């Protein structure tokens, strides 16, 4: 209507301008976007009243420049916990809240489309961007993304789900050919995106850098048209990842509508200006105006609903304080208690000896486009000060001076920050600290970021020798006295845990909780927060145990391809099916209280499976319980994983003795497996497994499918 | 014709008698079969000139009573190497020879049908009968069985392939419900039987004890009629395993023609006489005479070709000496050299210190119906004496007296023989032996048998403490002097190998080689035989590494079901696909010489794949080379193993510098995967991997399938 109005007005060249970004703003010869720091803008066409639309990162919060040249004003953003921590909440409602808060900020700073959430599968722990992805499971990931997208888009701005698809490693991501069976695609990698597209209707999708089965995703017609549109019914537009692909017209033919960020010749001497090349292809009949029209329409159908289109006056002053409370809540529910041998929460009196250089160099989140620049970021130490806990002040001063000393030293100064030695304390000095203090609290920290994969080496997936030395020594001397030790994992992805976990009494997976980290952590120690998070990803006993062994491809040092040999058997699907025991299993997490499951009733009417059960707080402290419903399908015709997560739920805050009724519905189509051509729901007996984790099944029931069901996409 | 002649003559009750055995001969009230020791006989019907047909075990050689009461004559049989060792030859031609030798014996002792070969898949190393099965791979197993069956049946007698199907554990085999996807069935478990049925046309098939997906195999119409007959075109008859199933008429309705051994009421107070029950069902219209007719016809169509039918006068005097040479050959090519750090073969002079109680208590094969009673069985020690090798005579006397001493002791006398302590030698006594001798040779022995599964415990899958003590001590002191140590594995199935293999210099997998064992072993040490065997099964680093973790079912102590969670990913299919490293991989084996592969040419004409390559003996001793061709199919639509064995070959005896041309053809239908409904050969690029083992690939080529191909059975 209005869209088809503008379309009939546009000249050929205006249509071309519209499908290409204006170049990376503020860099190279490029002018800052009106929202300095923004990832990109579209070409304005003042004529027909088209404004430049603004795109900005990212998954951990709006990423824009805090300050602006010749400006007295401020533009700070809320830095939320990382996605893997958000996912650990297993809380849709909360994700929706996080989306609304980010959404308000996005709107009020004049941004039209937020580049989030990222929702690639956790194929392998070493992936540099796992921290900004949700899960190794498509249901958990898809559900979380949907909730986040509904939140963002309740605010009049756009969400962009990414990266479509199978961007599961950073190594050579812009060239690597990802070889994946159609079955693994549909069951694992596309599956999350399918859920998000159908349940939340994101304004836009960002095509991945990598090739899929021979074709760049930004140039893959099967992916962007056949799957995305013709099967799933996507009605937004697709944009390319930044500088992705190698042919602009092939991108438009495949259904990649918006090429970003534009002016690719600025980072690759080989690329042509994308507008020149497209104009040429229309001129030569390599590209038809009809195809160009469909691209422009896809973009316009969406962006006429953007605030920019309606000249919306933004305040440049969102409610930061209100949002910080949301970020704190998000983190509070996302901390995972991994181990507690009568160690947590800490007694009121408890005098804490705080170890680990990361108590001060607290990691708020990984680097890259998923980074953020908040007005502040509370470290673990500062959090403990603020809460006025009983910490060893002499030790804290010792660390403060140690860090500053070596950060100024040639071998350990920023360029990225080199990893500092952790065993600088005398064996005797720790003996004294053990006599003086009540408990020990050890922070071990890890950081990753876009563009770099982790390696299965010490200081990375494994503890460095100095870290294991520190833990062994602190453990021994604090255990010498009748005292407890606690480790805080300030990490973005699984690390080795088996070799040292038996040495310590408590283990909090604090991940990377954004600006409010220290505050969240302090409140978890004291029991003010009752941990309710659970793993969205499997912690392997050793790196050699992970099924995605081909990571990061062949040849290892410069991978040109990587094939998913493990296929659908990725994450817990692998460990359950082939009987490999994880260090900590998918969906595992402890509580400061106990829960009891009961009253299971499963019913299937041929179109809907209904699982009902009661969860009662059986302990002495209020808490939330995440419950998980796995379906074990019969063996029947084709091979299937041991079980598959089909639904989940997080109870309200239950006081002791309180209980809740849990009612979950699963459509029969979600019980299907893909056989290469069709989705099939095989007839036979199915098991319902309601768990507190994938291996802690509290309730079991069966139901039967009488007639097989088939679905050809 | 003749069959349909007799059929029209038979009375109703004669037809019934014919489909039931006459009871277990020589046991309970039962008379010995005319061939005493035979497993069973059919009912004679002198009227229409029908004789009692004789059935006898077994896979390791004809099993009958050597002596007969009131008889001056002898009836000894050749005891061949066990099937897992036969399979290790990877030699079809040789298997055919073994079949002919067994076949002649079977004929001349008045037996009509030999109950062999057994060809169940090696799902799990712990299975008690793995020793009498070929492989974890269906191509290797099916090819070996086919070659054996052609051999047996060139002699005018019948072969019986068993056990159909998925009899992969002994625990509760007569009741356990085996839960297997149709895909795993068709790709792994049925697949071997399919090959044997189509390539060799066995006279008969023996249905397994266990249930398959809810139905006893002897009562499973899908298996015995739909798969066996309607799809595969089987034209023999099916007999039940001994006392299998629980309903005689259900057995006949399913396509199980001959019920064996008859008189099931003799071992199970609950069963009725099968003739009574069948007569009753015909009487009541539970069973139609038409179905009975088809059973009797199936039996008769086959057995009118049996020697008994034509009153064949057998000599009761086969050529034992000629066959013993075949048994020696079989074993010679079936020994697997696993490790050789410049230790083998032994120098002419070498003075051998022989350790291990199994040097005298040499295991010729496992127990059960697969057992045999040969006129003699050469132990490892006796073999070394006979060959006149330079062994420590003082030590041999020490062992001889030790064994006899404790075999007479209460704790270690037969009832089965309790496992004897192996570390009875002083640390000092071994020091002296190390000074006196040139090399050490350590025999470690294992035995299993029908009806008992092995456990992943010391003394079984793992070395007992005394065995590892012995090896550690002998290794240390012989290595103290500049001397070598060798271990001989006289086992029927994989054992743990990683913990101790680095301590020793050589390792010969001698399996269990039947009556000629000692002779074969001696000739391998001296280099008279150049080892050419290769593993038909994977040796796991540890038992926890094996994918068939559900073995032996739920509940563990009294399993009522066992589901194949690992599905098609069994054996090397699992280890390759999910990157778990074996101790020794499928198809691995060393040689006293070296070989070089070359001149690869692969061509595909759309119906046949052709792989050609040259193998040259590049070393200093004559030898044979087993080569293996694995196909790695593209990922395409459905998940597939990393690679799959599709063909193999064993070269002639090549002298140094000699070479051979290898030409192998693979029908396009063998490139297929089963998707639950149809066999599919997906289009795309395929890799040819010609290996000296599954992980030692010497040649690679690609070919392409242009158009997909489909086959609905
Ligand atoms: Br993905
Ligand atoms: Br733990
Ligand atoms: Br990390
Ligand atoms: Br690869
Ligand atoms: Br089988
Ligand atoms: Br080795
Ligand atoms: Br054994
Ligand atoms: Br089971």
Question: Can you describe what's shown?
Answer:
The structure is a homodimer of 713-residue chains. Chain A is α/β, with parallel strands linked by helices. Chain A folds into 3 domains: 311 residues, Glycoside hydrolase, family 3, N-terminal domain (TIM Barrel); 276 residues, Rossmann fold (3-Layer(aba) Sandwich); 119 residues, Immunoglobulins (Immunoglobulin-like, Sandwich), CATH 2.60.40. Helices cover 28% and strands 19% of the residues of chain A. Chain A is built from 18 helices and 26 strands. In chain A, the strands form 6 sheets. Chain A has a 6-stranded mixed β-sheet. In chain A, strands 10-15-14-13-11-12 form a 6-stranded mixed β-sheet, with helices on both faces. In chain A, strand 11, helix 12 and strand 12 form a beta-alpha-beta unit. The longest helix of chain A is centred in the first third of the chain and has 19 residues. Chains A and B meet through helix 6 of A and helix 6 of B. One bromide ion binds next to strand 16 of chain A.
Quick overview:
The first copy, chain A, has 713 residues and is of the alpha/beta class. Chain A folds into three domains: 1-311, Glycoside hydrolase, family 3, N-terminal domain (TIM Barrel, Alpha-Beta Barrel); 319-594, Rossmann fold; 595-713, Sandwich (Immunoglobulin-like).
Supply the CATH superfamily name of the largest domain in chain A. Answer: Glycoside hydrolase, family 3, N-terminal domain
CA-based gyration radius of chain A: 26 Å
Terminus-to-terminus distance of chain A: 30 Å
| Interface with most residues | A-B, 33 and 33 residues
Beta content of chain A: 15-25%
**Biggest sheet statistics of chain A:** 6 strands, mixed
What is the CATH T-level topology of the largest domain in chain A?
TIM Barrel
Specify the structural class of chain A: alpha/beta
CATH architecture of the largest domain in chain A: Alpha-Beta Barrel
What is the oligomeric state here?
homodimer
Bound molecules: bromide ion
Whole-number tally of structural domains of chain A: 3
Indicate the CATH class of the largest domain in chain A. Answer: Alpha Beta
Count of distinct strands of chain A: 26
> Could you estimate the helical fraction of the residues of chain A in percent?
25-40%
- Overall spatial form of chain A: globular
PDB class: hydrolase
Keywords: hydrolase, TIM barrel fold, fibronectin type III fold
Assembly: dimeric
Entry title: Structure of beta-glucosidase 3B from Thermotoga neapolitana in complex with glycerol
